[PDB]
Amino acid sequence: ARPATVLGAMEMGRRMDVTSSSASVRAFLQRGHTEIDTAFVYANGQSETILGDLGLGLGRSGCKVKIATKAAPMFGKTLKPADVRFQLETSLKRLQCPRVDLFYLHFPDHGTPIEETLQACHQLHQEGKFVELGLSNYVSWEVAEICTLCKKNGWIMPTVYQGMYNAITRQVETELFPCLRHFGLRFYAFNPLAGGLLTGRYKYQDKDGKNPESRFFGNPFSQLYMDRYWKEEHFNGIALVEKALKTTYGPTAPSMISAAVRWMYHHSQLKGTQGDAVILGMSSLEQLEQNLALVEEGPLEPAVVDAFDQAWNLVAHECPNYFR
Amino acid sequence: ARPATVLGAMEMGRRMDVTSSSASVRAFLQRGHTEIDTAFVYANGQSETILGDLGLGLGRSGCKVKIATKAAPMFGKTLKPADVRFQLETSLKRLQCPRVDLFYLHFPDHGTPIEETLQACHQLHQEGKFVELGLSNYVSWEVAEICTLCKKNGWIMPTVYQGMYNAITRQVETELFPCLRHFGLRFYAFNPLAGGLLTGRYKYQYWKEEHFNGIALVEKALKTTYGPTAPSMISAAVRWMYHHSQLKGTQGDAVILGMSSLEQLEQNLALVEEGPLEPAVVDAFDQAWNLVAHECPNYFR
Numbered sequence A: 001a002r003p004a005t006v007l008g009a010m011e012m013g014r015r016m017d018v019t020s021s022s023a024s025v026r027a028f029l030q031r032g033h034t035e036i037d038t039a040f041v042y043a044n045g046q047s048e049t050i051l052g053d054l055g056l057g058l059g060r061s062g063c064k065v066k067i068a069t070k071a072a073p074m075f076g077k078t079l080k081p082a083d084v085r086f087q088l089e090t091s092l093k094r095l096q097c098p099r100v101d102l103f104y105l106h107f108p109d110h111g112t113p114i115e116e117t118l119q120a121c122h123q124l125h126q127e128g129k130f131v132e133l134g135l136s137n138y139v140s141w142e143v144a145e146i147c148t149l150c151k152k153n154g155w156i157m158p159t160v161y162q163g164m165y166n167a168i169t170r171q172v173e174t175e176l177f178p179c180l181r182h183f184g185l186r187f188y189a190f191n192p193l194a195g196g197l198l199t200g201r202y203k204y205q206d207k208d209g210k211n212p213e214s215r216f217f218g219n220p221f222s223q224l225y226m227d228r229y230w231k232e233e234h235f236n237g238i239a240l241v242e243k244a245l246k247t248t249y250g251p252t253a254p255s256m257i258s259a260a261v262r263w264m265y266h267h268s269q270l271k272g273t274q275g276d277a278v279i280l281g282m283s284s285l286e287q288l289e290q291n292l293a294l295v296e297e298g299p300l301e302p303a304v305v306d307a308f309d310q311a312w313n314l315v316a317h318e319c320p321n322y323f324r
Numbered sequence B: 001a002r003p004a005t006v007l008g009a010m011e012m013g014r015r016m017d018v019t020s021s022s023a024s025v026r027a028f029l030q031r032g033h034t035e036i037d038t039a040f041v042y043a044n045g046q047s048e049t050i051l052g053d054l055g056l057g058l059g060r061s062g063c064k065v066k067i068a069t070k071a072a073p074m075f076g077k078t079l080k081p082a083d084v085r086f087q088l089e090t091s092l093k094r095l096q097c098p099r100v101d102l103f104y105l106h107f108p109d110h111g112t113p114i115e116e117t118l119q120a121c122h123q124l125h126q127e128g129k130f131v132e133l134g135l136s137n138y139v140s141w142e143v144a145e146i147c148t149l150c151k152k153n154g155w156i157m158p159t160v161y162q163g164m165y166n167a168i169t170r171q172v173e174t175e176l177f178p179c180l181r182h183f184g185l186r187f188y189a190f191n192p193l194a195g196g197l198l199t200g201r202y203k204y205q206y207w208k209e210e211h212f213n214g215i216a217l218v219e220k221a222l223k224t225t226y227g228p229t230a231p232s233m234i235s236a237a238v239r240w241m242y243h244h245s246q247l248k249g250t251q252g253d254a255v256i257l258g259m260s261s262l263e264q265l266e267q268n269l270a271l272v273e274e275g276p277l278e279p280a281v282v283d284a285f286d287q288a289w290n291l292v293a294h295e296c297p298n299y300f301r
């Protein structure tokens, strides 16, 4: 079976107003999907707030919708016990819910010993504030340390890892994926479109011109994205794929975005039977509706799959790290 | 200081006879180096056997030679406790020594739970059979699980990792090396010449076109920089390991020098003592690495 689809709620309350956010949730649920991904930091708290007002009854026995949130060592907070508790308790209030289904450590706090953070997570779990524990942006060997500590201490083990993965960003495959398989974590991929770079709407020289509001220009985290993906090699690879699309399908070929999405669902190492999933991103209802349709499309012809491999090969030596 | 040099003894009893092996040890020790690396499996057991017969007094107080060996899931053996013990006890007999300075798990036994193997390694260390524990060919995350188990259980922690690393084989830098620094393991690099590719003796006529293109870039930089007094390709590759890699002599990191002959060893011992390379040549090695990073062999199994 194909990977699951998770709704990324990062723009809810930022570029997306309440109306469009609500519409997006409805569209996503109508497609049969159930999991929504937000975070304490998203839209400075508005993503969670918007979601918690939809009258969905999050965290209550009988909710078919599953909610994930995250605690982050940012905005002046760390992953010390008190700060982890502060974030989760705040998220529960914003989400108007008694427990979240999945609670992540958003990214590492290298200034707080991990066992301290984990002990806090275990206590919060024992209080009934979350069902499953997740990690994001931890290196493979940190995941293994965490799982070993949890096992030895009798603490809830993480069962989900959320990481950066797309057709031209595959660092996770080598060391992380086998670790996750070993310890029993399912993988949820973010940046499936490389923040929009894999839609093909950009050109390298673009950064040297004025650009409309987007992930790469005008976003609070645009610099992070330029450093991550704005490299000549990423652009040359996309170019190979666009060429193979035409050569194989002709002017009726699937679009670059269609290709990139289908790669995630049909040609990646993600496995539906392992519970793996793709987190869709969007900055408008229109984009989401488009993407939701693309998820249902089928596999690509081999020549195009080969082109994506070629593109990955071109950029591998400068792939952004999946860990921080 | 520069990284240390460790004698790789795998060919003692295979491509190298007793006479050459003995001479090789003398040449290595004459240069001031001290650590010798062997394994239960090397040369059908003859590597340890030959080393044991050299009269070095291994494992004893005042010995100036340090010896390493390894246990592997080979020859019908696994890394189950009884089999780890069996291999070390055999090695001690063959090496004619009461202990070894470093005992490795040679490569993973995915069929034996690692905590079972580790407990046996602890027991053997408590009997005084080895000083330090090492790992080889384990993936970074396995190293972390091992260290975490050892710390929680109060068992000897691994302090050495031996793995593949050379100027065009750098996968270990990304995930392995930070893990090793975190948990306190030094790193011993093997295959510093990438199977001979980095000697420049092979040409396109598994290594692909981009590999030979890489070597060409380095050769071109060497000629542009130094002209008629350029280091050879083999010299440059060795100098990269000792002067321009992420190995740190103050962390106890080292390079394993392999040999299939006394002559090859004497040549390589001389290269170790050569100096740094100019930046343009180092840049070329980086460019060569960038050409083949996407198809780097895994350092683990």
Ligand SMILES: NC(=O)c1ccc[n+]([C@@H]2O[C@H](COP(=O)([O-])OP(=O)(O)OC[C@H]3O[C@@H](n4cnc5c(N)ncnc54)[C@H](OP(=O)(O)O)[C@@H]3O)[C@@H](O)[C@H]2O)c1
Residues within 6 Å of the ligand: A007, A008, A009, A010, A011, A037, A038, A106, A136, A137, A162, A163, A189, A190, A191, A192, A193, A194, A195, A196, A197, A199, A213, A214, A215, A216, A257, A279, A280, A281, A282, A283, A286, A287, A288, A290, A291
């Ligand atoms: N754990 C983490 O560290 C982390 C980090 C990143 C995201 N995530 C989660 O993953 C979710 C998805 O990740 P992501 O948002 O980066 O996904 P993505 O699909 O790689 O990037 C989404 C962006 O691509 C563009 N895009 C998407 N669909 C499009 C379409 N149909 N047509 C044209 N452009 C389109 C839009 O860019 P423009 O805005 O420029 O229009 C959109 O904002 C987020 O909402 C969040 O929940 C987690």
